[PDB]
Structure 1
């Protein structure tokens, strides 16, 4: 049922850095995730240009932000290309080993955490505000899976049997106790207007 994997040593080191380094500008985590969703949404667009049947799993390309104060989660859903089990296991489709190399090296030469995404490892900025992150994903070439980690050197991957989503990725952020501002309508609007104003797909902020 549940498979458990060790993070590579560098990712495990990146995550510990993210979690442990005092750094107040935690809000960038949302920009980095909406920017991954946009990327994943570009890819399915690009693919559907030459093969229109790639969109049979959903023709709408968009991003939804869904807070839930009862569960203490913020969830970014996109109808992008999604990831295959292989992609999930190989660091969620990213060049994360060499990306963390570059990033640590940049951190040496005068970069701050907010720059994480120029190394292609922006996803991990989720650990700025979340204590567990769950990624449900569905790519056309594969079944639906859920990747999950509370950091600590390991992640899990299982097949997901709850709500088929048809196509895309859902990043559920189980927020830290003291990071619940990110569940506020007003606070999320502010960050999307500030950091993600010019994204080429609709972003819908759901209400509770």
Structure 2
């Protein structure tokens, strides 16, 4: 288990997301589904020139899995997945620019719902989650668990849980007052409103 500090701008973004009063929290789901769809586009594209990239699983899809016992909502995709270097360095590097632009736009009169336009939509998870665990597997790399409760740090470890083939699972440990996102009716409402034209099947598991 290695512990890392977020780069300063991402820590700042996460605190803004956690601290700002903003009632329209439901947009976290559209952002994470859009991230999954982007990951799925990438593996689909890559497989056109290299068919063996789909040996780790041919099906391209998204599952949404609520668990009231654990108070988690899990978004699973079989997209391209993330490497160790993604988790520790690259994602944070790419996001440094988008954070700055987003934070400047918010001063200009934009709102938190537009986070996705700046390539940092993942961090909207913290509108609803006290902790986020990300399990991910890229071809030719090992499976990793990334985890953060914000507070300026995150951890990465080699994951020895259930092997997943290829892709990413984002596990949102929901805040005590956000359990509405475990309800079938609520998730269905949100997917229909914001994520109706995603080009991959989205399966909403029932409890």
TM range (shorter): over 0.9
Residue of structure 1 equivalent to 2:31? 32
Output one character per residue of 1:91-111: Cα deviation in whole Å (capped at 9) or x when no partner.
647611111100011111111
> CA separation in 1, counterparts of 2:194 and 2:90?
25
> CA separation in 1, counterparts of 2:200 and 2:5?
35
Cα separation, partners in 2 of 1:78 and 1:93, compared to 1, 3 Å: farther
| 8 Å CA contact retained: 2:147, 2:156 | yes
Question: What SS class does the counterpart of residue 53 from structure 2 fall into?
Answer: helix
Larger CA deviation: 85-94 vs 175-184: 85-94
> CA separation in 1, counterparts of 2:92 and 2:56?
21
| 8 Å CA contact retained: 1:83, 1:93 | no
Relative to the length of structure 2, the TM-score reads 0.98
| 8 Å CA contact retained: 1:144, 1:160 | yes
| 8 Å CA contact retained: 2:17, 2:126 | yes
Kindly indicate whether residue 85 of structure 2 is the aligned counterpart of residue 89 of structure 1: no
Cα separation, partners in 2 of 1:56 and 1:94, compared to 1, 3 Å: farther
Cα separation, partners in 2 of 1:27 and 1:71, compared to 1, 3 Å: same
Which sections of structure 2, spanning at least 5 residues, go unmatched? none
Relative to the length of structure 1, the TM-score reads 0.98
> CA separation in 2, counterparts of 1:135 and 1:158?
11
| 8 Å CA contact retained: 2:137, 2:144 | yes
Output one character per residue of 1:94-139: Cα deviation in whole Å (capped at 9) or x when no partner.
6111111000111111110000010000000000000000000000
> CA separation in 2, counterparts of 1:60 and 1:93?
29
Question: What SS class does the counterpart of residue 99 from structure 2 fall into?
Answer: helix
Kindly indicate whether residue 118 of structure 2 is the aligned counterpart of residue 119 of structure 1: yes
Segments of 4+ moved more than 3 angstroms: 91-94
> CA separation in 2, counterparts of 1:3 and 1:18?
25
| 8 Å CA contact retained: 1:84, 1:141 | no
Question: What SS class does the counterpart of residue 5 from structure 1 fall into?
Answer: strand
| 8 Å CA contact retained: 1:83, 1:169 | yes
Alignment length, in residue pairs?
A: 207
Residue of structure 1 equivalent to 2:61? 62
> CA separation in 1, counterparts of 2:5 and 2:119?
20
